[PDB]
């Protein structure tokens, strides 16, 4: 998918657009990441601050599955209900008929409070939650049933 390349246009011109003085050479400043502390330093500082050095603790044999904890916000919480039942449950805003939501089956670990669900009772089954999420749910009329 090539022939709209500038080589096709530089045909005829001597240097192929790399210059007569500089004279395109092989690796005139180094290979790869050479000189990060010596002659490419002003690039690394300013555009890569933090590149050199260690910081924190090591973890030998980290498994990310231990740290699987994907988050759901309350604004997106009502999407775990299918659209078929959603208006039914938006109406009949009641105890004794309140929808159950398994956020873990949806694929979520922690619930978080980014804002303003409607004043409808909801049962939210979650591994973890936050303070505001629990407050907002309990204020809308629901509860959080912890699970594992």
């Amino acid at each position: 998918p090539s022939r709209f390349t500038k080589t096709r246009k530089h045909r005829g011109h001597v240097s192929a657009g790399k210059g007569r003085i500089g004279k395109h050479r092989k690796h005139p400043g180094g290979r790869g990441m050479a000189g990060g502390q010596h002659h490419h330093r002003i690039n690394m500082d300013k555009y890569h601050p933090g590149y050199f050095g260690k910081v924190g603790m090591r973890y030998f044999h980290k498994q990310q599955a231990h740290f699987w904890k994907p988050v759901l916000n309350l604004d997106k919480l009502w999407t775990l209900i299918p659209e078929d039942k959603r208006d039914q449950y938006l109406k009949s805003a009641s105890k004794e008929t309140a929808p159950v939501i398994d956020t873990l089956a949806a694929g979520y670990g922690k619930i978080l409070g980014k804002g303003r669900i409607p004043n409808v009772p909801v049962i939210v089954k979650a591994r973890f939650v936050s303070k505001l999420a629990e407050e907002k749910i309990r204020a809308a009329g629901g509860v959080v049933e912890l699970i594992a």
């Binding site: 400043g29 231990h66 039942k85 004794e96």
Partner: protein, 193 residues
């Protein structure tokens, strides 16, 4: 070699990689060979359905334990409860695994029921003959799927008691954190003359 604002790339090509490039032009051909092998196997073998009946199994870690999965085999206990022996099961199309154990009655009963369904829905040819033709199926897995068990219904009442789930979690965490200190403190306080 370092230039304008761009990410640091880590491209691992400082070896003779061109000698070990593999391009899968053989993809569609290997597919064809694989289909032909399945077909040849079905025909050559039998009216037998190309695969053993595998069990339902609860997956490992917190990431995946919510799912339920197809395992390898049927835990000699489960087989004995289904009412047959391991050797006959292996002859009859059941995968057996000696090196796993039942700790959960739900999975145990699910797999036993699965075995009973299989034992009812098969017909086993005699040792002698007369070969009543049976018009085979190719997938025990497709005849016997892997269903996710549900926990609770959509709708329930609200059972609140003001326990503050967040506080609950924090107190569990604190209890685990400060268990050993307390179990040393009480121990060294019991040393009262």
């Amino acid at each position: 070699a370092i230039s304008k604002n761009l990410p640091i790339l880590k491209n691992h090509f400082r070896k003779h990689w061109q000698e070990r490039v593999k391009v899968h032009f053989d993809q569609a051909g290997k597919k064809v060979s694989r289909r032909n092998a399945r077909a040849t196997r079905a025909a050559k073998i039998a009216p037998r359905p190309l695969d053993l009946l595998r069990p339902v199994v609860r997956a490992p870690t917190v990431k995946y334990n919510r799912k339920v999965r197809a395992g390898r085999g049927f835990t000699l206990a489960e087989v004995k409860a289904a009412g047959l022996t391991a050797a006959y099961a292996r002859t009859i199309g059941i995968a057996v695994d000696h090196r796993r154990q039942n700790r959960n009655q739900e999975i145990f009963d699910a797999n036993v029921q699965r075995l009973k369904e299989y034992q009812s829905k098969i017909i086993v040819f005699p040792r002698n003959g007369k070969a009543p033709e049976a018009e085979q199926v190719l997938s025990a897995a497709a005849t016997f799927p892997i269903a996710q068990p549900a926990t609770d219904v959509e709708a329930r009442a609200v059972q609140d008691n003001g326990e503050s789930a967040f506080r609950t979690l924090r107190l569990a965490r604190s209890e685990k954190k400060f268990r050993g200190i307390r179990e040393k403190r009480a121990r060294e306080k019991a040393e009262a003359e």
